[PDB]
Amino acid sequence: TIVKPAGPPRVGQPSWNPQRASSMPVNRYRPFAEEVEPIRLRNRTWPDRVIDRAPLWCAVDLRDGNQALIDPMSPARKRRMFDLLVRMGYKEIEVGFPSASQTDFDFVREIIEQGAIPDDVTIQVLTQCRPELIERTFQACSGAPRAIVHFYNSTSILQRRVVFRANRAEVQAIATDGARKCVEQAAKYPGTQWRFEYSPESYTGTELEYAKQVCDAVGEVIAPTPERPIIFNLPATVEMTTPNVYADSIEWMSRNLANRESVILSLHPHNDRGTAVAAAELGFAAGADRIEGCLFGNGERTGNVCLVTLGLNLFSRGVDPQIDFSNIDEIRRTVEYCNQLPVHERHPYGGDLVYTAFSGSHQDAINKGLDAMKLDADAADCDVDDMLWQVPYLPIDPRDVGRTYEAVIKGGVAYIMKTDHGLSLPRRLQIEFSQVIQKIEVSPKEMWDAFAEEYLAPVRPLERIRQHVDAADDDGGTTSITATVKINGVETEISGSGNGPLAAFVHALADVGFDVAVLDYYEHAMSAGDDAQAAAYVEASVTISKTVWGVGIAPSITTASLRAVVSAVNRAA
């Protein structure tokens, strides 16, 4: 649980800062300069550059995004994403990892065999360096008019040590042997315009000099030219530090890589620290040529850099992204359908709430802005929709992405019951009970009082005093129960038999006018420990026919279940 930090403030911590040291294990984590290496770059220039052109985009939604889904794309969902990317204006699209996945293989075959690839589109496929995998990759691409074969191997300090147990020379040979195999296979497949991409995977965890050495060595194998360049893609496989440091690394690589005119320098930033978009934008200013990402940031864990945010961040500062975002709702609908994951309410440009103002003051300012625009428009005999957007609080005209400005004018049962009472209510009980609270805001204490009054407290018509359980020694034997109960205050013996104690008690009640059928049942521990309490929840149809829930809490799994039956009976009556 959360324990308030109580350790001494740092020596020299300002008097106006009363924060205390936490007990989080910070010593298990090192500054980036110590984990990897310090910054090699001198006289950086990216801080002085403002982006004034679109990068070359590559959309990796169909492979890198797809790999990240709990419900992977069906062939129909794949075609719909492919079609969306084509219609938006993307010209490089990663379509699979065909040597690793038969469904990827079959998808690549399908788009090639059906003639589904536009003339200005280059499909891209991922492969590891193993020769049999590169062969299978070329097989999948057979008959493509053009293709990027993207090969990679992990180069990071960490992976060399603990994953590959290999030295720098061995790891570089993995890459150059892979490059040689690609060159061999390309010569065997005529017609196709083969293009190559190499990634030193886990680049952000790799020494820059080494990443440069491996890239250069791979380039020497491929022998690219300005007309037929190679792509070096430098991923933040884990986003390990601040975007300025990533950008410094990009500028250094851009300045130091051999044969630079024949290189397309590509970025592939993940979002582990929340700064993928920033890494991409600063990295582009640092000299990169190309950015790989996904629509709305899909990709493993925190995702790939968001292509929508990057593109509209250009548009909103007067630079054409060369991609159509005129109908962001259509893009969002299609992405949600394809991925089966929602765009968050606050996602830049696309989110439900991003063009909303709930504040009277902000609303008024927005309207003053719109009015001044309309006055300037009327004066210049212009359509206001063609004038410079000048509106407080709205970075863009929502209409320019097909959206609108909105001047907009639950009891928490599950949360409160679990947090304050250690009860995880079955969903249908949550529903059953929250309705009561609606009628009966209700404070946390009031909610509990009502819960106890309905489920826990009642002892009429039925009260269970004590009982004797005669359980079967042998698996599948009969269990008997005799209980002392009160029925509207009148002490009564009941007795029944069944496959277990819960069944036995249910059957015993029938003799006394309660026809009870158990429809569902749940139980959970209420603390750690051998002798911990149990909470039981029983859903039952009760005649003297209403279906109701009951709740029981007790030291024994058995007794909690019996209490839950009594609770249900009393609720039915």
Residue 197 lies near Mn ion (rule: CB under 5 A): no
The smaller minimum CB distance to a second copy, of residues 184 and 300, is found at 300
Q: Which is nearer to Mn ion, 64 or 463 (CB)?
A: 64
* Site residue total, Mn ion (CB under 5 A): 3
Tell which one of 67, 233, 254, 304 touches Mn ion (CB under 5 A).
Answer: 304
Smallest separation (angstroms) from a second copy to the CB of 274: 4
- 289 CB-near residues (< 8 Å, 6+ apart): 55, 56, 264, 265, 266
166 is in an annotated binding site: no
Query: Min. distance of Cβ 268 from a second copy in angstroms?
Result: 14
**Interatomic CA distance for residues 537 and 468, integer angstroms:** 21
Question: Residue 133: which of 149, 121, 117 has the closest Cα?
Answer: 149
Is 565 a binder of Cl ion (CB under 5 A)? Answer: no
* Residue ranges in 483-542 that form contacts with Cl ion under rule CB under 5 A: 500, 502-503
> Which strands sit side by side in the sheet containing 462-470, from one edge to the other?
462-470, 479-487, 490-498
Residue 27 tokens, joined: 């010593």
DSSP state for residue 250 in the 8-state scheme: H
Interaction of residue 557 with Cl ion, rule CB under 5 A: yes
Residue 184 token pair: 């061999």
Pairing of strands 92-96, 146-154: unpaired
DSSP letter (8 states) at residue 516: E
Kindly tell me which of 142 and 161 has the beta carbon lying closer to a second copy: 161
Query: CB count, 10 Å around CB of 97?
Result: 24
Q: Which residues contact 35 (CB under 8 A, 6 or more apart)?
A: 205, 240
Nearest approach, Cβ of residue 519 and Cl ion (Å): 14
Question: What secondary structure, in 3-state letters, does 459-515 show?
Answer: CCCEEEEEEEEECCCCCCCCEEEEEEEEECCEEEEEEEEECCHHHHHHHHHHCCCCE
Whether residue 530 is annotated as binding a ligand: the answer is: yes
Report if residue 61 touches Mn ion, rule: CB under 5 A: no
Residue 432 Cβ, how far from Cl ion at the closest point, in Å? 23
β-strands 290-293, 263-269: how paired? parallel
Residue 474 tokens read as 């042998």
- In 3-state terms the chain splits into helix, strand, coil percentages (rounded to 5) of 40, 20, 35
448 binds, among Mn ion, a second copy, Cl ion, none (CB under 5 to 8 A by kind): none
Q: Which is nearer to a second copy, 18 or 190 (CB)?
A: 18
Residue 199 binds which entry of Mn ion, Cl ion, a second copy, none, CB below 5-8 Å type-dependent: none
With beta carbons less than 8 A apart as the criterion, state whether 109 and 125 touch.
Answer: no
Q: Which is closer to Mn ion, CB of 156 or CB of 304?
A: 304
Q: Is 64 a binder of Mn ion (CB under 5 A)?
A: yes
268 assigned binding-site residue = yes
Do the annotations mark residue 43 as ligand-binding?
no
Judge whether 555 is annotated as a binding position: yes
Give the residue with the Cβ less far from Mn ion, 299 or 458: 299
271 is an interface residue for Mn ion by CB under 5 A: no
Give the shortest CB-269-to-Mn ion separation in angstroms.
8
Residue 63 annotated as part of some ligand binding site: yes
Q: Is 64 annotated as a binding residue?
A: yes
The partner in contact with residue 132, picked from a second copy, Cl ion, Mn ion, none with C-beta cut-offs of 5 to 8 angstroms by kind, is: none
In the bound complex, what is the minimum distance in angstroms from residue 491's beta carbon to a second copy? 15
How far apart, in whole angstroms, are the C-alpha atoms of residue 164 and residue 154?
9
Decide whether 53 or 184 has the Cβ nearer to a second copy. Answer: 53
CA distances from 250 to 7, 31, 253 (A): 39, 19, 5
Least CB distance from residue 234 to a second copy, whole Å? 17
Which is nearer to a second copy, 184 or 329 (by Cβ)? 329
| Position among 178, 283, 299, 461 found at the interface with Mn ion (CB under 5 A) | 299
Count of alpha carbons within 13 Å of 64, Cβ hemisphere only? Answer: 29
Residues of the binding site for Mg(2+): 64, 268, 270, 304
Binding interface with Mn ion (CB under 5 A): 64, 299, 304
Q: Which residues contribute to the annotated binding site for 3-methyl-2-oxobutanoate?
A: 63, 237, 268, 270
Q: Which residues are annotated as a binding site for L-leucine?
A: 499, 503, 530, 532, 555, 557
